[PDB]
Subunit: 189 residues, 2 copies
């Protein structure tokens, strides 16, 4: 009732915030990530390297969020930790996020999302592209919210399902507020 | 020579890492790692640290692979994933376990060695986030640096790239020698005014 109506509202706000961030990224000359470092790499190699890195970066951040929300409830067994992480980084989950954000086949969608995450993070380290790091953080947060909401509806933990859904929804609502306010401050510059 | 620097490097890595680890063991926060749970079927906190340490090692290793290989366009992408796999695989983590004498080298299983290394990494990182135990974060970084150095030295000697074998090995050896100075220096700082 309250959670399923909020979940629908969350998907709209996530789309709006992520679309707004990404629309300003496409104004940046650095946006074509595959054509950088041309004296040292190629388009195909950049795509594999960014996907290589994005894979591990997503994996680490997803692991951190699983711990963040599940360790509070001792009723939850360790199977759900690995279960949730697997559910969060699998290509089907990433492809759903691909579709929700209208980024553009099963396997390609996940690879593209991973390459985008990794490319954005690496760009923010090698250039000034703090907007690109903001997008990667918000994209992973939306990936975790999307995954965990689905996962805990299919695999409700003992007694605390609605409370941990509320924790994740409250957390993600605050992140969306933070990402929105960061975007306006960066764009009101 | 590079191999003279290598054998000296393994002496210094053992001493720095053992020196940091000895200070961590004096800290009451070390108890929370529950490394005893490596022998137990009741090993929830140990598995959770291992769960996270696995991912943290993967990301840091990925970052180090990109760091050294991307300046060499001679090196194809297959060596990026080849080096990462060689670095995080259970066999490499076991060799580090044995090099540091973390536990018994015999009545302590092969996969168990890699799991303990991963759990120790994860627990240290989580302790630094939750308890501001910066010495534990220093150790996690130093341990992964040694893991990468040890792995990269063996990998590129076994799989020499085109033209640049010696140059990339010099790159990694010089870097790790600088890290060892940094970790030694950071430790001396910490132990005189924590
Ligand atoms: Mn990958
Ligand atoms: Mn992939």
């Amino acid at each position: 009732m309250s959670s399923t109506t909020l979940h629908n509202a969350m998907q709209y706000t996530a789309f709006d915030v992520l679309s707004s961030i990404l629309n300003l990224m496409k104004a940046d000359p650095l946006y074509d990530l595959l054509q950088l470092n041309q004296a040292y790499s190629s388009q195909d190699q950049e795509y594999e390297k960014n996907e290589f890195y994005g894979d591990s970066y997503l994996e680490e951040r997803a692991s951190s969020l699983v711990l963040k929300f599940l360790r509070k409830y001792e009723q939850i067994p360790f199977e759900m930790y690995s279960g949730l992480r697997i559910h969060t980084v699998k290509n089907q989950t990433l492809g759903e996020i691909f579709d929700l954000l209208h980024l553009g086949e099963k396997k390609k969608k996940g690879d593209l999302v991973e390459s985008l995450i990794g490319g954005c993070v690496l760009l923010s380290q090698r250039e000034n592209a703090t907007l690109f790091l903001l997008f990667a953080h918000a994209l992973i947060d939306y990936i975790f919210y999307h995954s965990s909401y689905i996962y805990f509806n299919a695999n409700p933990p003992k007694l605390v399902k609605e409370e941990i859904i509320t924790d994740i929804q409250n957390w993600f609502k605050d992140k969306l507020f933070y990402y929105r306010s960061s975007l306006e401050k960066y764009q009101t510059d």
